[PDB]
């Protein structure tokens, strides 16, 4: 019964502790610190008139898409600041968006419980909603594209789903979280994905089968952001306890914790650099931090946002970092 | 420096900016209300009088456009999406008077209202409080006195005194009385007067905000 569970939890904790021979801090203590990092506001995307909750970079590292309470997504050309597209939304309460890896579709969702997909390369010229993906019974946290046909989705229904856009329904529902799931991160090979939830747990899911491959705990509050390491064998979570963490899929435990006494504020977004050396965590203290992922030392600070930094992204070629904040302005560094 | 296609792209961006500015002005002229309450608190009746997930009810009164956001379909954690409603100019909190004699839900309304009125996000948003199902209360108080709901009640078992005690409890649950205010009201099973009260509360909030911008409040 439940005592058997408890015994299994004790056994798995003992196995993790036995396998944790050393720590990332002492393993990478000898490496040269990256030094101070200075990041100027290379571009300032302005035109949003309400708090920005999400953005996603295109696969070409030039276009991006941002969602806010304006009731409309905006597709920006980050190189020249031009607004490529402005897609009016059916619901103004949008807290997620994604840009398809092929660049053809753009998804967005929120309190409407629907991850709507919009077609960008239509023949008529105006972006139109191709599908209205409904079936979640709670607010929508983050829906991420797999390809032009499949899309994983994380909602407050305590479950993550894998919808097929062509038919419009779920083909695999990932259940097992206790509370609201607020984050997603597809593996670079797109075969597994980690979802962080409000029960202070991040679960490694396998899309092909559907079972919860692994679970990772250690946070002391709700998890707000998650992002795979570029290698695809690790992932960093950012929660409300003002601590980031870097868990390993193969070791099935954390390796480093990113925290400081000065920061007593939760993490609203987490992303990695192209090489995985830098961990850019956008906090709710109106700013972002840049952590040496191998040393847990704050390698830089990104200030300039008048409000909470809600969304953060790093270009696929690592050339720039774009942070969107509640002050309705995106900043590309 | 910019070729023909780049110039036309910049022109398209400027047109998009114009449309975005127009839409933003139109949306800023709107009045945003957040509707809250219990499942059997009569919010369905109230929205019927003015007319899956969130429910938007749009209506117009005295050339003012009100959008009521009902979040009754959200069963997740309140704090995880309550920060989205910072900009609402008022919170229409509906509480049923029939909740005092049917089970524990009166304490549920107490705690929900306390949390709503003590959120860090809603520290400056006025709460328009509606007392719904008052006609049934007026005759069922004699059958079930308010002392059953709260033994600490000390007064005549009349509907007027019970209503006064309720609107004293709700206001005592407030903690930010100096910044925000609770505009309590009784539905009286009518629509026009309810909407008129809502409009009065909204315009009072607007004038208070203008005095705040002036420096007076």
């Amino acid at each position, epitope marked *: 019964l439940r005592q058997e569970a408890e015994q299994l939890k004790n056994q798995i904790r003992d196995a993790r502790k036995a396998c944790a021979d050393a720590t990332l801090s002492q393993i990478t203590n000898n490496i040269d610190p990256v030094g101070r990092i200075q990041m100027r506001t290379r571009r300032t995307l302005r035109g949003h008139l309400a708090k920005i909750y999400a953005m996603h970079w295109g696969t070409d590292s030039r276009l991006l898409v941002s969602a806010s309470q304006d009731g409309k997504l905006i597709i920006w050309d980050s190189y020249t600041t*031009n607004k490529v597209h402005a897609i009016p939304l059916r619901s103004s309460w949008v807290m997620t968006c994604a840009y398809a890896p092929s660049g053809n579709y753009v998804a967005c969702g929120g309190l409407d419980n629907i991850c709507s997909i919009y077609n960008l390369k239509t023949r008529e010229g105006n972006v139109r909603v191709s599908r209205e993906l409904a079936g979640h019974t709670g607010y929508l946290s983050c829906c991420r594209f797999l390809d032009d046909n499949q899309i994983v989705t994380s909602s407050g229904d305590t479950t993550c789903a894998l919808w097929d856009i062509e038919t419009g329904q779920q083909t695999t529902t990932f259940t097992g979280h206790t509370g609201d799931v607020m984050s997603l991160s597809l593996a670079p090979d797109t075969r597994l994905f980690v979802s962080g939830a409000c029960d202070a747990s991040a679960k490694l899911w396998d899309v092909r089968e559907g079972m919860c491959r692994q679970t990772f705990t250690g946070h002391e509050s709700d998890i707000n952001a998650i992002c795979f390491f570029p290698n695809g064998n690790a992932f960093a979570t950012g929660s409300d306890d003002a601590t980031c963490r870097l868990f390993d899929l193969r070791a099935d435990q954390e390796l480093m914790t990113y925290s400081h006494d000065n920061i007593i504020c939760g993490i609203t977004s987490v992303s990695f650099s192209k090489s995985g050396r830098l961990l850019l965590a956008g906090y709710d203290d109106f700013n972002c931090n840049v952590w040496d992922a191998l040393k847990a030392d704050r390698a830089g600070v990104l200030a300039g946002h008048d409000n909470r930094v809600s969304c953060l992204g790093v270009t696929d070629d690592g050339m720039a970092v774009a942070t969107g904040s509640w002050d309705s302005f995106l900043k590309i560094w | 420096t910019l*070729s023909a296609e780049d110039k036309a792209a910049v022109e398209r961006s400027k*047109m998009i900016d114009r449309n975005l500015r127009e839409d933003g002005e139109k949306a800023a002229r709107e009045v945003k209300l957040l509707l809250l309450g219990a499942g059997e608190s009569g919010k369905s009746t109230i929205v019927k009088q003015m007319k899956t997930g969130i429910v938007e009810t749009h209506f117009t009164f005295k050339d003012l456009h009100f959008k009521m956001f009902d979040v009754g379909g959200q069963r997740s954690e309140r704090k995880k999406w309550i920060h989205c409603f910072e900009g609402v100019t008022a919170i229409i909190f509906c509480v049923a008077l029939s909740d005092y004699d049917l089970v524990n839900r009166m304490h549920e309304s107490m705690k929900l209202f306390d949390s709503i009125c003590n959120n860090k996000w809603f520290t400056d948003t006025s709460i328009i409080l509606f007392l719904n199902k008052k006609d049934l209360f007026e005759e069922k108080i004699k059958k079930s006195p308010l002392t059953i709901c709260y033994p600490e009640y000390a007064g005549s078992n009349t509907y007027e005194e019970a209503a006064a005690y309720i609107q004293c409890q709700f206001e005592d649950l407030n903690k930010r009385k100096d910044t925000k205010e609770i505009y309590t009201h009784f539905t009286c099973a009518t629509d026009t007067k309810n909407v008129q009260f809502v409009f009065d509360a909204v315009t009072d909030v607007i004038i208070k905000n203008n005095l705040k911008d002036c420096g007076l409040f």
Partner: single-chain antibody
Amino acid sequence: QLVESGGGLVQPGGSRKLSCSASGFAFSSFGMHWVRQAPEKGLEWVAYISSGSGTIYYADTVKGRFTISRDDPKNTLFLQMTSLRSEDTAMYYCVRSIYYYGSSPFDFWGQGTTLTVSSDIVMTQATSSVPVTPGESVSISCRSSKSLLHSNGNTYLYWFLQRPGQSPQLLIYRMSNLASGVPDRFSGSGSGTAFTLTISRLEAEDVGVYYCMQHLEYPLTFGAGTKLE
């Protein structure tokens, strides 16, 4: 679906109104052009109006004699011609074009309407006729006076294919990209000055005249045209 009207016989020195009715796309966000083709010569750009009518351009040969206007609520593009010359006789094509990042300008061309009357970058396409057989590759060469490789990396050169008795269609945009729905056979290549269009596994549907246009700056000038048969 663009269809034009208002052509026909006109006395020289007169005036005529050409109406382009559009149906099936967002006319408001689409820039429109007007490209005329002589009864025997190649295409020649005539007029251009942007989205919202904020920007208007004309060919320097006919500057000020034509007036191009838009009616988005009516969804119709008008072109008023005054004081026609005998050389003005041509078939006019209403050409859609939307400009943003990654868009495909000049993608859809109207059916065109005929009209008979009693420092610019010059593009050379001297290979006038190429005798070809089905199933064999072919290469068409175009040359520009000024390099089209702009400082932002875009090489503004378009390849159009006009079938005998059919309106021209966009074939390749920006010297590399393939227009939507075009067979994968076609490829574009070349430096900023000399450009090549290569067709592999040629079939009968490839018979026609190929034109190279430059979109680096106005006026837009087409090539002489290469005829394949």
